[PDB]
Amino acid sequence: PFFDVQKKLGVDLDHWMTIQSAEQPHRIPARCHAFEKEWIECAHGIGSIRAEKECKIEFEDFRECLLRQKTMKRLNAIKRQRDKLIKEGKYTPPPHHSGQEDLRP
């Protein structure tokens, strides 16, 4: 049972720490505020059964914001091909990726 006392009495006991998209102190956004907002606004009211199949793309974007598995996989691929071309000698790093250019601002 979920006796929803908080909605029946109209009190906010623990809805505030529940999601990252809620009102934070000093309006601090979470890192995946936009993704979680998009997925929550997709899955709202349609039930969990329709949400698991009709909001898959928002949930994959949000889970990949959280864990960054695809981004780290792409960085692994680029850094590994770069290490292979450094070991073979077919590539050289530029002066702005070796630390010789005295950064912009």
Partner: protein, 347 residues
């Protein structure tokens, strides 16, 4: 124990169960279980003897391990979902860990190995609290996460609980251990129908709480903790043997009693979902607990016993023990089957 402090501690047990029932945030679920455990530990140590200290230590270790597994499940849910709603889980690993942790809090097999011991070490009123009130909160969490519960895990735990609760109580002469293996078997019966129809899970929970409350209240009214002291009841109060008769017949599932009501409905909700073999062997195992109930009332409740001379002193005194709700609970634990469609109020 000071009665004011006893009231405060029982209200804290109730408050922890209420916090698990009403809260939307997983941390408050964990807090409610922590509050419930921390508050129930003195209820078990009410009489201050080494068996209660052993029972409370074993209960503490099992519920603490379960609470740590629950928090690890919540934390993996936070990894893979970035949020905290008490709803379905977003990882099968969190699903498995939370199902395991709630199975440890209920006392389901293979984590059943504390329920016959702890119930033996604590008094009858605290064993009543353990076997009735402490089932409400994890069944609420299982009620809310059932879109994520793995079916094979919950059915493995359920039928393992039913077999171990069946074949564990055949050997038992202690009444508290009979109630504890009955607890394990009934939690298997509640959790096997959970993913099919959770209203029948709630029906089994309420009928179980009524019958268990009836049995522990009769045990407190007669001050009997063993089979043989239960046999000495007819020469003191003959109606109490009749009531433990009809209530133990109801807990095994005889028709036309009310404890036949849930499990029949459970079979009725498992053949709709085209499961035939599973409720069949499930009720085959329930026939074994009904069968040792029928030995434990045929051989040792009906046919009248050798008594002791000091019992003829106890004829001159009536029961001044507060048998709170005992006739109501005895009527409800036996004569409720003609009102079987009352279950819709639990939908």
């Amino acid at each position: 124990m000071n009665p004011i402090i006893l009231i405060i501690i029982l209200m804290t047990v109730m408050l922890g169960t209420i916090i698990v029932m009403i809260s939307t945030h997983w941390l408050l679920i964990w807090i409610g279980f922590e509050m419930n455990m921390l508050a129930i530990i003195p209820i078990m140590m009410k009489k201050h003897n080494p068996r209660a200290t052993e029972a409370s230590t074993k209960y503490f270790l099992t519920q603490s391990t379960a609470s740590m597994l629950l928090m690890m499940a919540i934390i993996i849910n936070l990894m893979f979902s970035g949020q905290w709603t008490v709803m379905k889980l977003f990882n099968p690993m969190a699903s498995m860990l939370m199902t395991m942790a709630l199975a440890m809090k209920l006392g389901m097999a293979p984590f059943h190995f504390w329920v016959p011991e702890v119930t033996q070490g604590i008094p009858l009123s605290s064993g009543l609290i353990l076997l009735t009130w402490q089932k409400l909160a994890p069944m609420s969490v299982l009620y809310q996460i059932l879109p994520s519960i793995n079916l094979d895990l919950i059915l493995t735990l359920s039928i393992l609980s039913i077999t171990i609760g069946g074949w564990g109580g055949l050997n038992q002469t202690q009444l508290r251990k009979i109630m504890a293996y009955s607890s394990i078997a009934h939690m298997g019966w509640m959790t096997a129908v959970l993913l099919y129809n959770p209203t029948m899970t709630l029906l089994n929970l309420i009928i179980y709480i009524i019958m268990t409350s009836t049995m522990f209240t009769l045990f407190m009214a007669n001050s009997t903790t063993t089979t043989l002291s239960l046999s000495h009841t007819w020469n003191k109060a003959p109606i109490m043997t009749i009531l433990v008769l009809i209530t133990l017949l109801s807990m095994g599932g005889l028709p036309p009693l009310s404890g036949f009501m849930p499990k029949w409905m459970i079979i009725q909700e498992m053949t709709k979902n085209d499961s035939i073999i599973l409720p069949t062997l499930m009720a085959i195992t329930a026939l074994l607990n009904l069968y040792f109930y029928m030995r434990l009332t045929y051989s040792t409740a009906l046919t009248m016993f050798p008594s002791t001379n000091n019992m003829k002193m106890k004829w001159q005194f009536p029961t001044t023990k507060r048998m709170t709700l005992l006739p109501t609970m005895t009527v409800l634990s036996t004569m409720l089957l003609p009102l079987t469609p009352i279950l819709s109020i639990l939908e």
